Symmetry: D2
């Protein structure tokens, strides 16, 4: 199927039109969705007002096995992160529905961590390839794992930075050097060029490849009500450039 | 007059609908647009597909005295940007009285990428803890035209806005250094204050369509042109309006120091 | 009494000669040593090869009330450091009333490396431009005992010294964060102020010989033990003297917040 | 000859006793000096009060060809640098005599740039190996050259960071990334452990391997008089890990 896919930004994000999301889509719509997702890192479906907790949950299961910690968020995820990277097999994907949408503010921003890696000069990609980092849940908006800083993506084979606010430190370097190296690689992920911002409407859905993005939820809506609900899908164990695996410690 | 005003982001930015920009809008509509501008820092008008080089110029004049910098043919003041401003700045802060405002029109608009992001330098200011507001009040910076996408001047880091009375951070990528401080100290003080300006909360991103027009209060924003569109054509045209001499928290004024 | 005092570095540090440290020095010699200490921030006595665990302890008591922290046998208060403090700090700033002073003796001294460097936190303060003195006055930091080489407390960043009246930076590697600021802002404000403390100009390095003794005013220094000697034995023994509760620029006092 | 060599710090610097410096030392004393210099990166000779402008200059020539820009310094070199790295063939060595020595202050500090490199974790040495930097004389205390950040030392073969305040930027990286990477590699050079500080007496001489050190002159002596005089020796063209050479641009 060629679905109706309109890219949102130069280097990540696509709206998909003419698809009402259900627990009843057929393998072709589902696979096309899954390739749009790998290609564009985050995908959006508007006017999905027919959807409700249970359709979301049953629509989710069509794309892998759901995992706990359906989550409700209402306090606010404004730091750049990849969902649950303090566990070994952190989600492969998240599906997020807008239940209550603020009139101004309330946006969400995604960063493509594959392209982030691609744009690093070669010597700085070689070094990213050899680094590992400690993820902890000292930080949660809603455990200590070691992940390689470069995740070879189990399906595209695309390499992506595996970083974000869950990172406690880079293994094997002083405080000062871990901050400097994390600032470099991290500031490549959040470079504006590598991101896409979604202004939400009630009933909008977004689905992202957590193996290959970070995201941040803008806290600018003061006390306007904002409720979003999230389903995540279990993910594989991260494999680094040299084949080594993540290990929870 | 209450224009039909839809805020884009929590802290900056408003679309204005039902207004057809021309050299012939009445004083009232202009005043209301001036109020939206000061309040929202950047305002957007979609579907101005009737505008052209000359009407953009004539429309500009209704909001102040346009000024140049090499301009588009047929025009007195129009600067074309194409073949990129991907760097947080405030326009021409390397001169003493930098534009108070720029009016930008989309001529050619990439199918994907091509966006622009504005930051609310007055909100950046309000959010800093008192002691660091106090320090920002007391600093000065040298701006230069080394780093231009399209001269040295000394500006306070905090500009008292000549109409709102709101204080704003005055920084961006025209800054060579903070006057009075080592290089390491300059970079760390700059990095703190700048990082409030660009904090996502303080920004608004616009996706352009041919005929979109944006107007921003350059006294109280920085902006950034996102360079993600490859070789897709992107043509925008800009008119700037002459601005006043910035006045610091304690009345001091900027001074050009190389020309 | 004018002791025989030779300054080591331009801005901190003095060797004192012709004095044999004992539990039996007269009030005069002690007062003169107290004056050298406050003036020079760290003072050095070579060739105290007669000192031992007990005489070090007895000598300490002549300068204030010694305090502990697991101590050396035979002693009430003596801490042994060996098998390393290579990190700029001020002693035990994770407690509310941290030592005002430590007295350190070299027991075993590497043939090469093994040095120690002190920084004059009061000079670090004097050298900052007025506006950044003003900001440093207004800040507070949390110190913790996460990072120890040998509890959370809140200290002003500027301590008014209880005898000299000199203000000093109160920072070092016991600081977890600046209270009231993001992580990025804390690290940048910390990095600015710290970088004045350790600026080479403000420091003095000592090469140890067995029997060297150093005494520093812990209210107005940081120090650092240089880790360059490999597996060469290094044994030093330290006695700390109880200190007052730090008082900030505007009279506020530190408060322990976890124990 | 085993000369009388007493190391000053754990990882750089040695005083040499029982040697009066002259234009008349014999090849054995001179070679032993040259090996002490390569081994310990900086070497010091006390009580050389017999020395004067011309003996210095004639003692110098016994260790390579002198090069201009005998220099007099009196304003002050307090930034970490390697002498003349804005030229292609910057000095291999400097010889510095203390003419007037302040009573307190006035010290000098050297950093061993070889050991600095040695202590970097492997992946961060691999990346240093591939970097180049632009040296300029926008900064002089007393031209734009590209040097590799890692100089393979023409005699020891020891690799050393080639950095310092003459560096305008790292070639091939944004402003922000060049500052972050330079801070990392640079803060390894100036780590206290890698340095040695000399308190000068009138007539003290110091000679350093500029291929393998940086140094900084402490400005803490206010208006006390301080005069030192320096002779430098021409050096080879820097060769990087991969054999490429520096090029003045
Ligand atoms: Fe999340
Ligand atoms: Fe601009
Ligand atoms: Fe200590
Ligand atoms: Fe030099």
């Amino acid at each position: 199927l060629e679905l109706d896919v309109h890219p949102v930004a130069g280097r990540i994000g696509a709206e998909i039109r003419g698809v009402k999301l259900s627990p009843d889509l057929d393998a072709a719509t589902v696979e096309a969705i899954q390739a749009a997702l790998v290609r564009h890192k985050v995908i959006f479906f508007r006017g999905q007002t027919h959807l409700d907790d249970q359709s979301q949950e049953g629509f989710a299961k069509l794309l892998g096995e759901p995992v706990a910690h359906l989550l409700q968020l209402d306090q606010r995820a404004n730091s750049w992160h990849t969902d649950v990277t303090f566990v070994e097999a952190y989600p492969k994907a998240s599906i997020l529905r807008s239940v209550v949408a603020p009139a101004s503010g309330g946006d969400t921003v995604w960063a493509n961590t594959a392209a982030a890696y691609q744009e690093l000069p070669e010597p700085l990609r070689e070094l990213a390839d050899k680094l590992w980092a400690v993820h902890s849940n000292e930080y949660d908006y809603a455990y200590e794992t070691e992940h390689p800083v470069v995740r070879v993506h189990p399906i595209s084979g695309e390499r992506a930075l595996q970083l974000g606010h869950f990172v406690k430190r880079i293994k094997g370097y002083s405080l000062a050097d871990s901050q400097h190296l994390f600032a470099v690689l991290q500031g490549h992920v959040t470079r504006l060029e590598n991101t896409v911002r979604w202004r939400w409407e009630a009933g909008d859905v977004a689905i992202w490849d957590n193996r290959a993005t970070q995201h941040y939820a803008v806290d600018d809506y003061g006390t306007q009500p904002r409720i979003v609900r999230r389903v995540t899908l279990a993910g594989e164990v991260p494999v680094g450039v040299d084949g080594q695996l993540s290990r929870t410690t």
